């Protein structure tokens, strides 16, 4: 124990450590984008007088008639069939309210929920009294968006077997732009734990469910060899998310293996992240390339 | 740890405020001051239909739906 | 006291149409959804914004057609030579937060977030000269950092009038001299004015030159902040990919 | 409670009008609603009526000690106020974002223009000096509160008359209107506010708008400018986005209007002084229209105060005298005594122990 | 139910308190218990307990008449005496209960401010009398007045002497003087029922159902100081003349009480 | 807030000397303290313990001594709670927390030997120096007490107090005459300025420097004020649960040891920052 | 309830009568009606041999 | 007989069981009130020991409880009330409630016009079903034959009388009005 | 100044700062003694629960209001501390004070570990305490009385709360004293107040600040505070017994 108290170090600008030139088209608000005969406005731009004017900083992306600007910092926007993770913030008479880092709140209707029993017995107003008992305030679920409302609100449903109330683990919240779109957002990494890559920026890490909806509590102590894996994945996720890294299965697996040589407690330094992110960068370079 | 006896302020703060002829004369009440009902049946003894009970026993017994 | 020498030099050494040195920054804080930091001359400002969220309190105070802009203003108790501590009830803070709400209810393209609030906070760490334009520029940078779409890049600058000439970017010494001060909030592409203010007396013949000098000094602030934004976006584009 | 909502037929009709350059109450673009002033009996009190708006102004002075620093001037309070009776919406603590911009407009205009001479309001320095205190109230809201409030403050300040003092050696003395004649004030110039409204994104403007026209407008432009050709404040506000030719046009318009308004104010104050000096009757009472159904006047009346003695005498004589059961006070121990039905025991002791 | 139930006792001529509709509750007082105040007194009126305390300080005389010492009363109603009072700034009931006491202090001329000055134009005494109600059962303005008058009969001030070269104030804490009291204003309260019934010494429930209230305060020479009638049903000269006949006996009772408790030292 | 299962996982982890970050039951996260950041004031500090952010300022001004003692000055604290820290801190709402912190700081510094009081008096009964300590919360990320009790000792170490030699003689110029030197000042001897140590209790183990998540799983906590010499100034128990007598005695030892290490390492870091002077520049907020 | 293409009556009734394509239409989405279904019966099963609708 | 303080040793877990207003820890039974020591022997030995003050000044409502109320205002889809009595005993303060247009009759049926069921000023007997939301707090019900308005009041201040299951009639002017009469 | 009160002089310096009688000498005593205490419960008639605590020169009155409308699943516990202006050497401003808010928080963070709020969902309890006279340790009286009032108001609690107080002598051989008075508190260097649950044997609240810096004196201050809270219990034991015996027999 020595209680290191370091001193701030000046940041090096221009990202000169590697050196690259962009070939994209970059704009700032007020800039006049291409103003040809006929074009359609996207998200991030607006129109003035015979002009397509950018309204947010980013890069223009066009697919064959469409000028739009992709900003580099936004909040989550809902889409149909998207895996999300959220927390209950209000329990109403006929619905819950879930916070998922969006411009509004998200509604989980009672009509769409795997109620206890998990089969066809009945659904009536007798369940409404105890509905506000099990999905109480401040719980975690993992559902899928159903439809888009008329004011940007999202309705999410839990009509499957992999969805429902979650159990023990840790949660890490990041910006909703570092997650790579895929077809399998559920993972079972061969390390000793699992992960859910929420498209809204919520990362949930929990141990593997041994063999084989919130019905099981399983509030029993978790073995020592599982916590060290969860802490390692937590720190590695923080390390990749910090500088630039987009999160998905291979990057986390690559960084986890690179983190074995030295301890889990000592990786909080500005330089140990750099020496791990660069090593993962070159492993991706020597594998993809 | 001996408990003690009260004193004036406490023994007056803890006061419980809980015909004998006539005094304060001017302040009596006498000195200072047809109905044909034709009432209906007085209660309604519920001896009759009470619809909720009707519809319930009705449908349960009936149990036909045709 | 001389506020303009015969040679043409001011008290601090700059000419009539010369600005101070500005040094901005984007992305200062991590927890918030946006941040900025600007030091215009010897005035240090700061701005923090929070993205469109659920309305606090939920007291049915929403607008079904647009968003709710909420701007505050504060000042550190060591922001000037004397302590001058104030409670959070002053009408100077209220009028500054109302001019801030007025200009940002006009600059932001707000008809895209129905039933939503936007919380904007401004903190002044050292006040010497124009505070309004430093707060506007710091919150313009913070809003750009947060990714909120807006019509243009609003920038503000002040001006003055001494001895038949028009000044630019007045300081506290020049401000506390009883002169016709004047401030704008300009949109460079269209030339439109979002806010106009004035105090003290001024003849009607000299309004055109003070207003023109203020607009030109705002267009001069625009280029310097534009190069900062372009370098920041090229920095993140290089980092991303 | 709140104010009645605005329909979708009135908006269409007002905008069709404005497009057609014709207004509701007949007046063309560059017009004011005519004005009507009325003076109280004690100095510094007036009632101005612009169209159908009312403001009450009242000045009053007082002698205090002049802070620390600025040992040779006087202070000048102001306090705008919005009366719950002005309109349904006004509520004592629920309209706190209009009061601020209004007080500010008023104070910046009146106090930064330096038209009142606060130089010559001292008696000693470091010692008692006069502290004036303007006061305005809004009585009836029909739009354009600030033009009326400014004219009211002007007239109230240009009609006041101070007390007056004798100072020689190191000795004070305070007179009264019978011992010495009240004294006027010194007013350099006459700063008078003007307002402009913009309609459908600056394409049209209308001078001096009323309350419906105020709810169908984008933003407001105010230009406060004293007589001669000297501007004293401007404050763009509302929802407006302005050009540069328009500010100059507006400044011209405000010039013209302040010229006319100062003409009117001077004439009215002159007439009032002439009336006060001839020796005729003045005051709020002799202003009530007599040609109107809603006014009635009644001179004095002895009612008949011939009978009150007899009635009072018989009433006192005709009622029951105080009774004569007198109560006794009980003494427990010096410090506490009781009167009433009393308590059985002397005091409680070991009641439960 | 509400109106009809009470009138059963009214016609019976015995209200639920066990009173003959024209008699007062039991009254008791104590003086000289709080030793951190110049003067204090506790008043018990069969519930409706009120305590007052007096603190004396120095202050600068006013600019108009620099020979007067201020006296400032205040009445506070904490949320513990009753259950309808809520925390925060003082309410309407406490403001009226304070303006009434200020008016009584002014009109009654119980004290003269010229007896409090030390050196004219330089220093004057100031008296801070604060009343706190410990229990609200009814008839607040009677016990507040009795608490104030009882407290003012015990406050004693030390002899203060001002030097000439030093010009400071030297307090002689050994020789302590008394206060000069001129009159003894005692109040009495009546509650009027729907249109004709008047009762004495009401209760919170009765005030909850009554339609008016009247208060009259008398001197020791049969002179009225204030006639507080907030409004209600309406009265006649005969009814007022009936009220003052009871108030004379009440005033004699209270003045005998004060004349006896002070004698016991 | 966090769910019951997360609270169960966290409380189980603490009992196994493992935490979500990876440190132990007694580890302490690093800080980025700095000095001389603000111009208009006469001393500054900037402590960054994590997601939290502190910024303080000390200004010495002329004043008058109080009545009880004439040969002394006094200290004035004002813990502002800026609304940029949290949206719920908008306008009114940060008043109770600011008052709580200001009163705690007053209790910490309300002693005869806090720093000194003879040095801040120049003329008895007529003049004295006054110090205005102005804390400004910029962000909140847990352990707010220690991140301020460190920036106060840091800022107090950087005071100037420009020397005044004015003679008090009536014949002479009694009006305060300064030294006219823009760079002539005097240090403050802050060697034994106390600091706060927080000890959150989870399960039957006590944890130093708890995070917000680890604070939400705790029921009570204890604060100890220890100087560099190892003496106690203030001791306040804060929480919503009982603590038990034993845990007081076994928390006092951890407060002593953590205080000693904190003070020695802070003396070393401030001396390292001071050994090289006008070089090394100054970077902050940019 | 009748969920025929050209006639829509009581879409929330206890018993729904509909064409076959409606069943797949409500089976692609959730529609929260499958949870309270006890019996689903088909009236003409001989369209498995249909050349365009089987 | 002996009284209690909200903690003391009373019995072992083998020498009895905890009852109402009590808690247990470390194999002992501890008091949690200042009432009276009551041991309900019942049948089967091992009495269920409990402490009850038996002077209830206030009592919090539950999921299921009978309450006497007083209508404040009525709406087309709900009717705000004020809880006045918890079963029998008087209540020192007044809570709030709401009867939705599903709890009037014992069938949860359609129709059931709220306007002629719970006219304001009446006193009704109802049962709670829930602890409610922040808009409606107690969510009372009258879906029973024994629940409904019990003591009504006339248009001009005359005690009213039940006349049928749905209709009541004035004794003075013989006027017909609609209520929801509960069995006496 | 204030528009909701009666305005008097703008400034008023009390005569203590001009009091020419020099500060006297407190004296000496035995530090193993407690001031005799008399306690009464159920005083007020319009309050759901009340208690009055008096010992030596301290007079404090506490009243408890019942549950009202409006961590839910749990009820709040509002607290309010206020002392009479005619208490102590000088007068005090009626509007409030930071010390009062500090003692209110020291009350709220000490009475919540006793009551079980998991039985009053969406409800709240309000506790009001008033100090009629300040003649010694005050926070050791606003805890005992506000705990007696709660138990007498028919709310369910795990146990009572018993408080104590201590102070440090200023001599060259300082020693902690039990139940200090104003003559032994204004001449002291430090003070400590403990809140002990006598049956559960768990400390509820702790507060102390001063000039005592050795971590061997505070161990004694704490454990003699615990012995004091174990010696004040029997009087509070018979006070609630008498309160319930009298309240029940009135039916």
Residue numbers in the entry:
A (entry chain I): 1 to 212, 217 to 293
B (entry chain E): 555 to 572, 579 to 593, 600 to 632
C (entry chain L): 3 to 243
D (entry chain K): 1 to 353
E (entry chain N): 9 to 273
F (entry chain F): 5 to 290
G (entry chain A): 381 to 434
H (entry chain J): 5 to 188
Q: What did the paper state?
A:
For structural characterization, we incubated the 80S-bound CrPV-IRES RNA with ATP and with EXO10-SKI containing an active SKI2 and an inactive DIS3L (D486N mutant), with the rationale of extracting the RNA substrate from the 80S but preventing degradation when the substrate 3′ end would reach the exosome exoribonuclease site. Signal subtraction of the 80S combined with focused three-dimensional (3D) classification, subsequent refinement and post-processing resulted in a reconstruction with nominal resolution ranging from 3.3 Å at the core to 8.7 Å in the outer regions. Human EXO9 has the typical barrel-like structure, with a lower ring of six RNase PH-like proteins (RRP41, RRP42, RRP43, RRP45, RRP46 and MTR3) and an upper ring of three S1–KH (‘cap’) proteins (RRP4, RRP40 and CSL4)10,11. A notable difference from nuclear EXO9-containing complexes is that a long segment of the RRP45CTD (residues 281–351) becomes structured as it wraps around roughly half of the EXO9 outer circumference. The DIS3L subunit contains an endonuclease-like PIN domain and an RNase II-like exoribonuclease domain that interact with the lower ring of EXO9. Second, DIS3L contains a C-terminal domain that binds to EXO9 by inserting between the RNase PH domain and the RRP45CTD. The outer surface of EXO10 presented additional densities, which we could attribute to three separate patches of SKI7EXO. In the first patch, SKI7 binds with a short helix (amino acids 555–572) in a cleft at the RRP43–MTR3 interface, consistent with mutagenesis data, and is further encased by the RRP45CTD. The third binding patch is located at the EXO9 upper ring, where SKI7 (residues 602–616) binds at the cap protein CSL4. From here, SKI7 residues 617–632 protrude into solvent with a highly conserved α-helix that extends towards the SKI2 catalytic core, engaging it in direct interactions at the RecA1 domain.
The ribonuclease in these processes is the RNA exosome complex, which degrades transcripts in a 3′–5′ direction and in a processive manner. The helicase can extract mRNA from the ribosome and is expected to transfer it to the exoribonuclease core through a bridging factor, HBS1L3 (also known as SKI7), but the mechanisms of this molecular handover remain unclear. We show that rather than a sequential handover, a direct physical coupling mechanism takes place, which culminates in the formation of a cytoplasmic exosome–ribosome supercomplex. Exosome and ribosome thus work together as a single structural and functional unit in co-translational mRNA decay, coordinating their activities in a transient supercomplex.
